[PDB]
Amino acid sequence: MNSDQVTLVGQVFESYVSEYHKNDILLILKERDEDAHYPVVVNAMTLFETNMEIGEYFNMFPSEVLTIFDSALRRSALTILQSLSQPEAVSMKQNLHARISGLPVCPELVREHIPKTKDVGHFLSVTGTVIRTSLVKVLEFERDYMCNKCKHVFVIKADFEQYYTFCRPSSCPSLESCDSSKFTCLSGLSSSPTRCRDYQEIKIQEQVQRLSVGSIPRSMKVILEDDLVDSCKSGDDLTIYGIVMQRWKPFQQDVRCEVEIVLKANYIQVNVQKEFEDFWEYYKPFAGRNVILASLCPQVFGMYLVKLAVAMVLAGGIQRTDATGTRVRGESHLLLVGDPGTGKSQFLKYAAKITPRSVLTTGIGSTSAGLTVTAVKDSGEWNLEAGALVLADAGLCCIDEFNSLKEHDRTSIHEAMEQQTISVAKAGLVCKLNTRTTILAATNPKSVSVNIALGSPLLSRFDLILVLRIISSFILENKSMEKMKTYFCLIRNLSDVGNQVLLRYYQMQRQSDCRNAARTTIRLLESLIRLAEAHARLMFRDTVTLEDAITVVSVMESSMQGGALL
Amino acid sequence: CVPGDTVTITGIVKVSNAEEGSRNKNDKCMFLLYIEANSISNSKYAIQEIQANLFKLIVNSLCPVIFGHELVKAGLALALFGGSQKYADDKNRIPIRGDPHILVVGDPGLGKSQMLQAACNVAPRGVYVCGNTTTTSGLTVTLSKDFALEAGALVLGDQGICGIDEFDKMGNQHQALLEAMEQQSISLAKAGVVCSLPARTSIIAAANPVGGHYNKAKTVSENLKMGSALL
Amino acid sequence: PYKGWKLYFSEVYSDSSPLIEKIQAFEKFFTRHIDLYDKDEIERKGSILVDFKELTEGGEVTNLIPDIATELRDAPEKTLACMGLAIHQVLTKDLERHAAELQAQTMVNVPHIHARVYNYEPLTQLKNVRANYYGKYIALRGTVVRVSNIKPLCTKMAFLCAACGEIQSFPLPDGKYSLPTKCPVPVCRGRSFTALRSSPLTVTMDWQSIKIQELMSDDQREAGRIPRTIECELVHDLVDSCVPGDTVTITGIVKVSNAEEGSRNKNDKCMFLLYIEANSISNSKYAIQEIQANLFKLIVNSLCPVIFGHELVKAGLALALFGGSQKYADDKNRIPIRGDPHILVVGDPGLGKSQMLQAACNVAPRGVYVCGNTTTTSGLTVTLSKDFALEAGALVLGDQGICGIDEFDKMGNQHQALLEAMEQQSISLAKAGVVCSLPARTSIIAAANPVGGHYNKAKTVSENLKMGSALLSRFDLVFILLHQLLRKYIGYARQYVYPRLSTEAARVLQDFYLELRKQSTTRQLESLIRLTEARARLELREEATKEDAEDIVEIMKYSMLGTYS
């Protein structure tokens, strides 16, 4: 940037902070610690809408623009401090960092993949999931030196591209041209300044749950500095803004070189339409249920209730919060106790391939090490590995051969079905992990209370329990997934008459009291919610009416007539 | 100070340069901090409304998400408070034990793991351990020589409560817990180093029966996957 | 006059240098054929694909390049540089003319264009590649085995001379940051340069390392010869153009590899080492008529000429070799389910079950044989190797082929992923935070031993066999027991004929299925269709009739006769 560009940038930013962004600087000045790094989050879109050249100069030279932003932030903080009636009530803060957020939404700045060599030197945002975090650290970043002829104390910076290593200069940067090349270092002689900036290396990875990310996601190292450390943990969904840079080490006598593309972070953020509107108008409901059920799994004969129950599984649900602050789930649970080879496995696999953010397994083929948590270790270091019940957070988990698991794999599933969480306590890794997911299971068996190899607490853990020429020509004529995927996506973002229908049905199952009757906890109530949603969800409604609740009784009664009693 | 004490340390903040690691992946940090200790001090109304149905209120408030198990929650509160550590310091009369232990024999789907979680959450010093990924150093003291003794789950739970879920799946990595429940100590004998470490902890544990649902004619010592050495 | 001269040549521009002649030759060639290529795609991808037959066309467009073959073969790094500079000059002249027309009603920055020549001949096989090919431009064709990850690679570095101010683009050998020893101008030799890493002359591109194995004849050239392999380096647009298992044709230069790998033991370490710098990569993805005109029994008996009996076992092996229809509706994303049938051989020792699996992997164009004792999970599943790369296993190496598993009753958890491959045609990977799904469209033929030895007793198959029902329900054929010409015929049928199921064949299957129901898994009927379609591909017929269905039914009758005893 030449003088004109820097001048215009500084003037625009100074006017913007003299007009707005006053309370943030006031709160920064009101803090007690004076040696702390304080961020100032600024929307980049609204800032670039005020002036045309500021955006060009930011996209052309991001580091110097951020430095000028920090200087103007210091000036504005001093100005606001001088405008107070009692300036001694607050304290000036010199470590101010302008953190860019809210870039203009475009594929050239908002990225879902790892930036390549073309994007080196550009400021952009990358959205991913944190797979690794390092400890918080302290060490030097600038080094003071002195001249042997003029006694001028200057400072040298650490090269970020060379892993913060210092190189000895040979020119005196004093105001008077010194020909002296002999300088002395003052970094280790004393500790007069506290010039040391925070540092942390995190590792992000592309989210395979996204549509743009392919099969193998890529990883990337992100460097957080100053107040950006301790802002995330392993497993968070981050949208990191920053500059793509290159850190390298060269060849030596016995050492090989290594070049790496890293992301120096500047701000951290923790996380056909007309057709769908026309399909929703026709649905607003029984004919729409027949279309969704036929389009969900057309490779199967009959089984109208299973296609409907799966529809509610992919449909639900929405979390709630009761008076005790307890999180009340939304995600469904469907059990398919069908004879082997009836096609129940063909359902779950196509349903897992048709749905974005979806997982699946085949029971004993994946034990508790592949269902919940695993403390991956290496030396005195460890991290948390996610299983089937965890990777399906805000998604679907399918488990065929559900009764072929051990009693401890079921115990882990018992917790995921009852708390939306999974307790971690392996090696030196103890934590509480959120597993907000729906579970679509299918059992291989040996009435429907003896053939099942599941305990009665586990059978009660499911919202719906279903038991499983025109066949040859149906395959012969067979001899879409994308729209149904986009359906349940838009659809997954969407009373007294309901509660009556479900309390009356439950009371009819509770009064005639023989030896069999369990106690409801939440799996009923919140099935009734996600079913009630589903009948309105699938048809795009915001209110549960009688038709939704009546169809629920038809499915729930058919599940208790022919299936395992709750 | 010994591992487990709550100490107040005043001193200067200085840069650490060794540097540790490595690796992976990855707790190595070139950038590093430490504290130069100048001094160290080692120690070793709403309550009155609660004292004035107190037992059942604390009992039911231990785990607000576990239905039933009124007697299990009753024993958990008793283990949280604990008896009297009747150690006559002027007579060297051993206090025996004032920390009771709890065993939960139940079928799956009862919430036994949740009771152990609530045991470690409401306690001021709780340590929760699963019974599958088990190591001898995970519970006993850990020897690391170049020697140092690192506190394990039985030592980390000192003056607190340690929860052991699915201990029927633990092998020899669990037998030292029997010595801790009785001696309040851990025995160490490895690489020529012989010592005895403190372990004044309360052990609450849960296991699964032998043949699943055991509402039959057998008793506890027969249906439970456990011998009489721990019962 | 030559903008971009330093993007291709490290020398100083001089109109007296012999480079100008070849540069203008290729510039004429590109100006005469500027409408044949897409200038937008050339500018975006930064490369251009030129057919080698166009350069050797002979006439007027190639008038100034009569010895293109010899100059490209013996001096590739010079000819390709001249060609790239020429196409860059053509593009920048056209774009400057367009910019002048726009201004009337001029700084055009055309990036580096990689001159890539494909369809090069003669084709050189890997076994004849010695050391004397260094610095030569050759073309190979082979199967990809390993595909590494994409990594940044700094090819060139900009250096500014503190004497005259000239900026040069010094290339790095293997990426090693070296300093220039003299200024490229023949005036001053300052020998002191400053690095300019943000300069456009500092070239940094994506880089990938693939491994290519020669197309080995599994029986002819397997008389003591091992399949040779070689490393290829893809860069820029050539990155991520092939997956492990594809048959690709790669044209490029032969260069010396210097890492060096190992070690050890004992001992595959080699300081001496070769590799190929890939310039272009192309990824695909009469005696037969006498054989088509007793065809079934002839191919069946010719599979294993040293195994007596097992006529039905050899009958199912031929059906699995040809295979059914991979009925994947690419316009509807309708999954093909599976067209590759699986075979199970339940038999006592001394029957020759291992020999049948050997013949299964020998006559197949892509056969992988595995023993069931020395078993590893990475031996069948995909193998993760991090510093990450995914290495194809026996279930992935057998893609579009047949994998033989002997004594799988002795395999533990290293075998359970084969069940997921037989049904999903894919392998699940979940290790070290890496989650993926790899292709595995293979046909699994396997053999095992019974529980208590000789089992001519009152027990059935699910009781006498050392195997559970989780794998018995996945086989299309279960047999109970108590060369190059047919190879070309099978390979031609898998590529030429895509079978269908007719109405007459269905009526025979409808009658047998209804009569089987009146005696009172669904995959049984799927086997009837998959084997009937396989019979149609065997007969080189696009449509299977009732004769093929009855033969498939009788084969299934023998499988159901040994069972249900």
Ligand SMILES: [Zn+2]
């Ligand atoms: Zn000076």
Ligand SMILES: [Zn+2]
């Ligand atoms: Zn010079």
